[PDB]
């Protein structure tokens, strides 16, 4: 996937958007844009509202001005995005016809949603017990284990959805860069992995501090708190609220506290193992390809739909992979999650990745493993034998907040 990030950064045409005028700059030194067309396009949260095509007449080291037609603008909420692509209409000796040589995208506008949902017809029922809290509404049921504080299971009808409880995740199966030159023999104490290892990240144990159910006028409200600790040190603290409403939608709200003195975590989010296994994945965010925070300029915001298989990157030396950032909506089977997050999804647990030396030895697991991150640390790469993640990409704030909406179709 890195290859794209290169391709885009090294592109020979450069853009600037000023109002509804696009300024094109050519980085060619000798040739004129003579097999180049510019395709443009506007879309609202994945929905296309407009397209153009314009032939480029820019000389090497030159500029070309492009004024766009009056752009539609809807009442509907959502983000409006402009996306442009340069195309090579004719084939060359090293390119096919219709090859895309460059691209760029901008966000044009946002119509924020000032609309409150339709007051639930129904109302969820909470059934208590000493083991757990159950929420029922319709065919749907959710169970939270009062001993662990996690949502242990959920049913749609008679079918269970989880194989594993939904839980907080602060680690990642180490990339090559996280490891560096650290070996079992000769440990590199500076390598991210080592730091994380040493600090207990990988083996910290949760601790129920609190777990309560409350009945709201039109919803149920669960509230929890855990502490992750290692050797009497509290590394992190997770505070959530789940709120299920008549719509049969759960809203998760999470708030982490990270100890100042612990290596910054690779990530901060949740994961769980789904029972289902679907053929496609559809999301509205950056893609289509694997993208990380310090590696996402080549990616575009849009609605992508791909086969599960494509959500895994077969790096010969298995590690965390396949992430997609800036996701606003993700759809898998009957599930739909909404918010602002980064995520990844495959048939391999982090642990399996982390414990397999070669990709050929991985085996697909029972269902689908889903990792949804409110936040993810960068991947680095300046070199692979010392920490290369720039500070801007390290999860060093201390306080982290995020929210989700899980639901069905």
């Amino acid at each position, epitope marked *: 996937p890195a290859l794209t990030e290169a391709k885009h950064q090294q592109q020979f045409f450069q853009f600037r958007l000023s109002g509804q005028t696009i300024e094109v700059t050519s980085e060619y030194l000798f040739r004129h844009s003579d097999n180049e067309l510019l395709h443009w396009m506007v879309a609202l949260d994945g929905k296309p509202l407009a397209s153009g095509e314009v032939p480029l007449d820019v000389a090497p080291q030159g500029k070309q001005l492009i004024e766009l037609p009056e752009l539609p603008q809807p009442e509907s909420a959502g983000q409006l995005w402009l996306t442009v692509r340069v195309v090579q209409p004719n*084939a060359t*000796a090293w390119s*096919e016809a219709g090859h895309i040589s460059a691209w760029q995208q901008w966000r044009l506008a946002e119509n924020l949603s000032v609309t409150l949902p339709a007051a639930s017809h129904a109302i969820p029922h909470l059934t208590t017990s000493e083991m757990d809290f159950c929420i029922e509404l319709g065919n749907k049921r959710w169970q939270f284990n009062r001993q662990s504080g996690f949502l242990s299971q959920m049913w749609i009808g008679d079918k269970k959805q989880l194989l594993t409880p939904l839980r907080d995740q602060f680690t990642r199966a180490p990339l090559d860069n996280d490891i560096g030159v650290s070996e079992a023999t000769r440990i590199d104490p500076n390598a991210w992995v080592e730091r994380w290892k040493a600090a207990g990240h990988y083996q910290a144990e949760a601790a129920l501090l609190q777990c309560t159910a409350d009945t709201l006028a039109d919803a149920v409200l669960i509230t929890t708190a855990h502490a992750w600790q290692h050797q009497g040190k509290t590394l992190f603290i997770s505070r959530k609220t789940y709120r299920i409403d008549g719509s049969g939608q759960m809203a998760i709200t999470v708030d982490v506290e990270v100890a100042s003195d612990t290596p910054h975590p690779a990530r901060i989010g949740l994961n769980c193992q789904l029972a289902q296994v679907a053929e496609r994945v559809n999301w509205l965010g950056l893609g289509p390809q694997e993208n990380y925070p310090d590696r996402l300029t080549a990616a575009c915001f849009d609605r992508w739909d791909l086969p599960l298989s494509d959500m895994y990157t*077969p790096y010969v030396f298995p590690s965390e992979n396949g992430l997609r950032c800036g996701t606003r909506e993700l759809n898998y089977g009957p599930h739909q999650w909404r918010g602002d997050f980064q995520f990844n999804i495959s048939r391999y647990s982090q642990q399996q990745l982390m414990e397999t030396s070669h990709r050929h030895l991985l085996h697909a697991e029972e269902g689908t493993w889903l990792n949804i991150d409110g936040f993810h640390m960068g991947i680095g790469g300046d070199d692979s034998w010392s920490p290369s993640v720039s500070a801007e990409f390290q999860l060093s704030a201390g306080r982290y907040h995020y929210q989700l909406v899980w639901c069905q179709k």
Partner: antibody, heavy 113, light 107 residues
Framework: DVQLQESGPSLVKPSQTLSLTCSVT????????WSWIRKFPGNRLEYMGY???????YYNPSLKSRISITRDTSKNQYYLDLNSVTTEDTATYYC???????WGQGTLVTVSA | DIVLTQSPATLSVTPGNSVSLSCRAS??????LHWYQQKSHESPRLLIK???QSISGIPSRFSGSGSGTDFTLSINSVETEDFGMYFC?????????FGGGTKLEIK
């Protein structure tokens, strides 16, 4: 030295899946790229596809996603699966390495009701 | 996709004489053009690769030439064992494609 040989049904029914095996002897299947080529009754040759060392596959668009090429290192064989065949798929099928130096003897497969 | 056109479709020659077969691509394919011989009830046999590169085990009388869109396979002093079909194939772009073939027969 290397030897390739096709095996599998010579007669199949319309709509079924045509499956052929190419047995490689003399060297490992992990030591080359493997292909499938077929010749239609009218002397027309078509390159169906190939699988390279990483496992990446390349299929002829003419096959409209009906083709799958897989490998089995333990048996030192690779395969061709062509789904929903029609009379248009009647042809002589050959397996050969990507370089084109090694070819199987070819096997005629007739698709008839 | 790249279309390869071969001419003539059929060529008759008397053993001892020389012939040249043509293969033209719909678009430039550099030097990625290979030549195959095929006889009835037999698998294709690679004669020349990458337009003009020789193949071990092939008679010296076979030679190839060309680049871009126009290629030629020449047979210096045809032998009876040379009668059969000749196909060109390009590997410059996927999908690889074959020409329609030229039949070489005894005159």
């Amino acid at each position: 030295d290397v030897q390739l040989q096709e095996s599998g049904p010579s007669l199949v029914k319309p709509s079924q899946t045509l499956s052929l095996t190419c047995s490689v002897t003399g060297d490992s299947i992990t030591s080359d790229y493997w292909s499938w080529i077929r010749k239609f009754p009218g002397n027309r040759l078509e390159y169906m596809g190939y699988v390279s060392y990483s496992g990446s596959t390349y299929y002829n668009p003419s096959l409209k996603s009906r083709i799958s090429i897989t490998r089995d290192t333990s048996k030192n064989q690779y395969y061709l699966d062509l789904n929903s065949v029609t009379t248009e798929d009647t042809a002589t099928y050959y397996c050969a390495n990507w370089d084109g130096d090694y070819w199987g003897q070819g096997t005629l497969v007739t698709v008839s009701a | 996709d790249i279309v390869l056109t071969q001419s003539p479709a059929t060529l008759s020659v008397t053993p001892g004489n020389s012939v040249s077969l043509s293969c033209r691509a719909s678009q430039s394919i550099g030097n990625d053009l290979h030549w195959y011989q095929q006889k009835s009830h037999e698998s294709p046999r690679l004669l020349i690769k990458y337009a003009s590169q020789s193949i071990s085990g092939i008679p010296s009388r076979f030679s190839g030439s060309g680049s871009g869109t126009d290629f030629t396979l020449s047979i210096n002093s045809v032998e009876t064992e040379d009668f059969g079909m000749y196909f060109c194939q390009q590997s410059n772009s996927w999908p690889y494609t074959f020409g329609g073939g030229t039949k070489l027969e005894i005159k």
